[PDB]
Amino acid sequence: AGVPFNTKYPYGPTSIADNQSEVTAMLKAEWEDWKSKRITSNGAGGYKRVQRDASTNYDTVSQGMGYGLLLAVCFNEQALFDDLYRYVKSHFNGNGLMHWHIDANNNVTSHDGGDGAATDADEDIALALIFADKLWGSSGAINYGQEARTLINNLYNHCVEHGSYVLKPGDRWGGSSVTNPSYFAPAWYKVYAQYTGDTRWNQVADKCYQIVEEVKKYNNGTGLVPDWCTASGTPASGQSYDYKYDATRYGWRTAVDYSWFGDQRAKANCDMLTKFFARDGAKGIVDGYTIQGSKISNNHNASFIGPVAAASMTGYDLNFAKELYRETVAVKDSEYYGYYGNSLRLLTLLYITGNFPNPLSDL
Ligand SMILES: OC[C@H]1O[C@@H](O[C@H]2[C@H](O)[C@@H](O)[C@H](O[C@H]3[C@H](O)[C@@H](O)[C@H](O[C@H]4[C@H](O)[C@@H](O)[C@H](O[C@H]5[C@H](O)[C@@H](O)[C@H](O)O[C@@H]5CO)O[C@@H]4CO)O[C@@H]3CO)O[C@@H]2CO)[C@H](O)[C@@H](O)[C@@H]1O
Numbered sequence: 429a430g431v432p433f434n435t436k437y438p439y440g441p442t443s444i445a446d447n448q449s450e451v452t453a454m455l456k457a458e459w460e461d462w463k464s465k466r467i468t469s470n471g472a473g474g475y476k477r478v479q480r481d482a483s484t485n486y487d488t489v490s491q492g493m494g495y496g497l498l499l500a501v502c503f504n505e506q507a508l509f510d511d512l513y514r515y516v517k518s519h520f521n522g523n524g525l526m527h528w529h530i531d532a533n534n535n536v537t538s539h540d541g542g543d544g545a546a547t548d549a550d551e552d553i554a555l556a557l558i559f560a561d562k563l564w565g566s567s568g569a570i571n572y573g574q575e576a577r578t579l580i581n582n583l584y585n586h587c588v589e590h591g592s593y594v595l596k597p598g599d600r601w602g603g604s605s606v607t608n609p610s611y612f613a614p615a616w617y618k619v620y621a622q623y624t625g626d627t628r629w630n631q632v633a634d635k636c637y638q639i640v641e642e643v644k645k646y647n648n649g650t651g652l653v654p655d656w657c658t659a660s661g662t663p664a665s666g667q668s669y670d671y672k673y674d675a676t677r678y679g680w681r682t683a684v685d686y687s688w689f690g691d692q693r694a695k696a697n698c699d700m701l702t703k704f705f706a707r708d709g710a711k712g713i714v715d716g717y718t719i720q721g722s723k724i725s726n727n728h729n730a731s732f733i734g735p736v737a738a739a740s741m742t743g744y745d746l747n748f749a750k751e752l753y754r755e756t757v758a759v760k761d762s763e764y765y766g767y768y769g770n771s772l773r774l775l776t777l778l779y780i781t782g783n784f785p786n787p788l789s790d791l
């Protein structure tokens with residue numbers, strides 16, 4: 429079970445890495461490292477949590493639980509998965525969605541609305557529960573499929589704007605006046621629709637692509653999406669309109685839709701983004717641009733490289749894709765900042781090596 433899945437995506441490349449046995453060993457070693465650093469029982473209520481790094485005092489965000497659950501199931505770590513999920517469940521809010529911010533001592537933060545949920549986190553948690561159902565089965569300690577079905581319904585009810593199907597950034601704010609393209613997970617939504625029978629999720633997927641289509645009016649042909657925008661693709665007040673540490677994830681979530689479902693909107697968008705990054709090449713990727721392509725920060729780190737490698741899967745240039753794979757492996761962030769980028773690195777490595785199949789496919 430799990431890595432190596434040995435599966436073939438139905439569209440695009442199976443993998444952009446060479447020599448699978450060596451890749452598999454690399455992935456397992458990177459997982460052992462991530463687990464050692466990121467998983468703790470301290471402040472976890474009897475369970476386990478994903479901690480952030482020294483730079484934010486080893487707090488937890490719901491996003492990290494989503495990343496950790498996806499990683500744990502892909503690496504066939506059922507006991508760990510279950511303990512991580514017990515921590516999630518100990519943090520479901522009044523809407524059945526995870527508190528987004530908890531300190532290292534297991535107190536929800538009150539200054540920043542820590543009790544509210546972040547939609548990207550719960551969508552990743554829900555997807556991870558579907559993988560667990562499909563990989564392990566739901567007759568044990570945790571009924572993954574029931575938990576998934578509950579979480580998906582809460583996500584729809586609270587994190588989708590009624591009528592328009594615009595994805596909201598949380599359970600209790602935003603929608604048409606402010607959303608986050610990097611949260612847009614069309615492939616996840618198509619899985620939800622198929623898994624649960626709730627076809628409304630397909631309309632959410634379509635609306636995500638429509639918002640990015642509006643962004644194309646403003647991004648100068650680069651494929652870059654803003655961190656935050658309105659449903660019209662225009663700036664969201666008080667929120668970054670640049671391509672920074674939110675927006676970096678868009679190419680990853682979007683490329684998966686191409687690999688899993690053959691979505692031609694995903695390919696068009698990811699090809700544009702990859703082509704933009706081909707201007708400077710793999711070593712030239714930096715950690716902030718305006719959506720018209722102007723560099724606004726100049727650090728080369730794991731928050732930005734692997735997501736570009738993911739976008740490259742949709743086929744703009746497969747030679748460039750191989751270069752991006754190599755760069756993704758090569759650049760690992762130092763440990764003071766070792767939470768975010770190195771988590772995206774491992775998640776994107778799973779995908780670009782052929783180890784993130786659709787959980788509804790034959791595993
Ligand atoms: O006021 C509106 C509304 O807010 C609700 O609270 C929101 C909150 O405002 C959001 O910030 C939060 O968003 C979380 C998302 O799940 C997540 O995608 C994102 O992830 C962070 C990541 O955790 C962090 O490590 C990373 O940091 C990088 C920096 O951006 C760079 O500048 C720096 O150089 O490098 C670091 C990495 O080392 O950034 C990413 C991307 O932002 O952020 C949140 C998780 O940390 O969602 C909340 C819930 O919706 C509040 O609940 C409401 O009450 C209120 O009305």
Ligand SMILES: *O[C@H]1[C@H](O)[C@@H](O)[C@H](O)O[C@@H]1CO
Binds near residue numbers: 715727729765
């Ligand atoms: O986002 C962080 C960058 O990744 C890092 O290179 C710089 O030192 O600090 C930024 C803000 O914490």
